[PDB]
Amino acid sequence: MNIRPLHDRVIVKRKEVETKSAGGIVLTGSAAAKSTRGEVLAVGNGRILENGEVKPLDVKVGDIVIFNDGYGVKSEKIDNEEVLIMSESDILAIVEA
Amino acid sequence: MNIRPLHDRVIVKRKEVETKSAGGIVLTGSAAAKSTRGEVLAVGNGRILENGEVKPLDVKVGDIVIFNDGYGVKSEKIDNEEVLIMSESDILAIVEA
Amino acid sequence: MNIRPLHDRVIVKRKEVETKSAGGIVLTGSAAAKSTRGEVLAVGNGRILENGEVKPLDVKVGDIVIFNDGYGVKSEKIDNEEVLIMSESDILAIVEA
Amino acid sequence: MNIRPLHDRVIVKRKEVETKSAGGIVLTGSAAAKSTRGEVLAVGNGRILENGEVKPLDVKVGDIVIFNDGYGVKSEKIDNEEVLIMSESDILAIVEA
Amino acid sequence: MNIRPLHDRVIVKRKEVETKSAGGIVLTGSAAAKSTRGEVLAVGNGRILENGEVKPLDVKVGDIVIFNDGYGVKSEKIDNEEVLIMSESDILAIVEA
Amino acid sequence: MNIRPLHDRVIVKRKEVETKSAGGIVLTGSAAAKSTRGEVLAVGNGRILENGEVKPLDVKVGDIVIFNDGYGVKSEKIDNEEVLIMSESDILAIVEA
Amino acid sequence: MNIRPLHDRVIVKRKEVETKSAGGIVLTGSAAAKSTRGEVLAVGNGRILENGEVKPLDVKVGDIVIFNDGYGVKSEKIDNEEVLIMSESDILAIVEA
Amino acid sequence: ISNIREMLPVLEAVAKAGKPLLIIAEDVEGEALATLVVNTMRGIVKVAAVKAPGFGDRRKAMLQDIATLTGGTVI
Numbered sequence A, B, C, D, E, F, G: 001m002n003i004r005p006l007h008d009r010v011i012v013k014r015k016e017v018e019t020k021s022a023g024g025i026v027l028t029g030s031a032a033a034k035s036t037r038g039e040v041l042a043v044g045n046g047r048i049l050e051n052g053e054v055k056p057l058d059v060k061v062g063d064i065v066i067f068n069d070g071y072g073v074k075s076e077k078i079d080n081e082e083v084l085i086m087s088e089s090d091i092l093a094i095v096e097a
Numbered sequence H: 001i002s003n004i005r006e007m008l009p010v011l012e013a014v015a016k017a018g019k020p021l022l023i024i025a026e027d028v029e030g031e032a033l034a035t036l037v038v039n040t041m042r043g044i045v046k047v048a049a050v051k052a053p054g055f056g057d058r059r060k061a062m063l064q065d066i067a068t069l070t071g072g073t074v075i
Helices: H008-015 H030-042 H057-070
Strands: A002-005 A009-014 A037-043 A064-067 A074-078 A081-087 A091-095 B003-005 B009-014 B037-043 B064-067 B074-078 B081-087 B091-096 C003-005 C009-014 C037-043 C064-067 C074-078 C081-087 C091-095 D003-005 D009-014 D037-043 D064-067 D074-078 D081-087 D091-095 E003-005 E009-014 E037-043 E064-067 E074-078 E081-087 E091-095 F002-005 F009-014 F037-043 F064-067 F074-078 F081-087 F091-095 G003-005 G009-014 G037-043 G064-067 G074-078 G081-087 G091-096 H021-024 H047-050
Touching: A002 A009, A002 A037, A009 B091, A091 G009, B003 B009, B003 B037, B009 C091, C003 C009, C003 C037, C009 D091, D003 D009, D003 D037, D009 E091, E003 E009, E003 E037, E009 F091, F002 F009, F002 F037, F009 G091, G003 G009, G003 G037, H030 H047
Parallel strands: H021 H047
Antiparallel strands: A002 B091, A009 A037, A009 A081, A037 A064, A064 A091, A074 A081, A091 G003, B003 C091, B009 B037, B009 B081, B037 B064, B064 B091, B074 B081, C003 D091, C009 C037, C009 C081, C037 C064, C064 C091, C074 C081, D003 E091, D009 D037, D009 D081, D037 D064, D064 D091, D074 D081, E003 F091, E009 E037, E009 E081, E037 E064, E064 E091, E074 E081, F002 G091, F009 F037, F009 F081, F037 F064, F064 F091, F074 F081, G009 G037, G009 G081, G037 G064, G064 G091, G074 G081
């Protein structure tokens, strides 16, 4: 079963937990931390606020995005895959080229 | 007696508490947790905010939905059935196909 | 003296404290709890917010309603009858048929 | 010197502290409590919010009103008389007939 | 140097600290308290909020006013005179006649 | 390098820390306190809020102003000179003539 | 991979940690502190708030800016370069000429 | 060990292999232990839980010895 986010919501999957290479050739062993990068899988319509229709989100399905792992960030299990659900507000940037 | 939610309110019933199968064949015994999935039973008109009329909700009666078990989530007893009442804001997604 | 609520306010009277029958034939003795159901007695004009006139409330005098016993809920004595005063926001649903 | 409230403000005087009769013929001795009822003495123009002019208040000078003794409620001394100053928001109802 | 308040701001000077006479002829000795009454000395243009121009304040230079000694209330020294600076919001009433 | 505040922001420099003369001829030795007075050096465009354009600030470059040393007040070093950066909201008045 | 901020977001890189010269010729050894100055590298479209389109930011790519190292300020690693991501709100001024 | 989480990955590969599993940890407690019971009690997997032989630095020493005799890796 594929998911369907409810407007203003973005569904992302985390990347690699401290990809073992930071600082060059050095294999940074797990130093108690996580990953802030992720990939878009599904996008809602947009924010409802201000009444006026619904403005679309600025993220297309499949961007590599940097987000803030704040409070509004929730974790879920889909087909036994590790996924995250947050709003656009919690997304900060995109990694292009 | 069937219920009638008061605009912006959604009535849902929880699913299975950690359906004993997570991770494949393994029977995950109750490890102190709950279920975040539910089914829609009744839907109010919509949000009143901004004055302008009342915009309808994006959930039809009978969707399989993922929600956040936050503070705004209340529990009730109808005909001796375990039900939940929250606003659309507390609903995060839908499980389609 | 009958009461007169001040716009957006609803006057309700609680029902039976854990009506002794829950779960079927079993007489659930007072297990330290209250009732969340009530009947409408009087209704104010409506919310003033947004300037634009005053939108009427969605509750008619005499509905059986489910409410949240939150903080905004106050208790009063009228003709020696136990009554409650809260806003529409604190009301969650109606019991119809 | 008679007072003059500053728009949205209402000036009221408390009634009797637990009028000794509650429950019928019984003289309820002071059980550590106060009175929630009061009489209107002076009324301001109205709320300024939303820019658009100033909407008048729904209380005329001389109503018997039920209020919430919240934080916004202040106490004052006029000609040596015990008075209260709060906003319309803190007023909940009127006692008519 | 006379002062000049910055829109929505009111400059007032306190009156007498528990004028020794409360309750009639009795000289109430300083019982650890202050005065809530004051006189207007200077008035700003008005509130900017809502964009639309600037609405003037409802206090003219020289009114005897009752205010709340809240947090927004600050104390200052002008020509060696004890003065107070707060917004209109902190002012509650006027003493007329 | 001269500074450039970013709309709604005001750049001021503090005056004299308890100018040793308070109360007349008496030299008030440093009694653990600071100065609340300052001079304007640079002014931003204005507040953006409400969408509609940008309303200019009510302070011209070079006024003697009284401000509140709140939280929004930050301290900086420019050419080795002690300066302060806050918003117009933190400014309370002007000293004219 | 060069970055792409998500409207209202600004990407900056810190300058020198207490450039060893403060107060003139004196080499201020690291006294436990950081730098508040930075350079702009990338800028988002602008704030969405108020519905009406999207107003552009007042910072062009490459300004020397003074910011507040508040909570909304996050730290990131791009091509092994130390970068910062915050909103325009956290930026206070520009260093021109 | 105290959490069933860490087990799932390996407990799974053992569940689809048929063979039983002995778990020699520093300790096994919490729901982890509690669940492990319900799993063999049903016949999902056959799994045993016993503490490690020894104490302090001697424990890890002796635990390693066991790996050698059985052809496994100390996690």
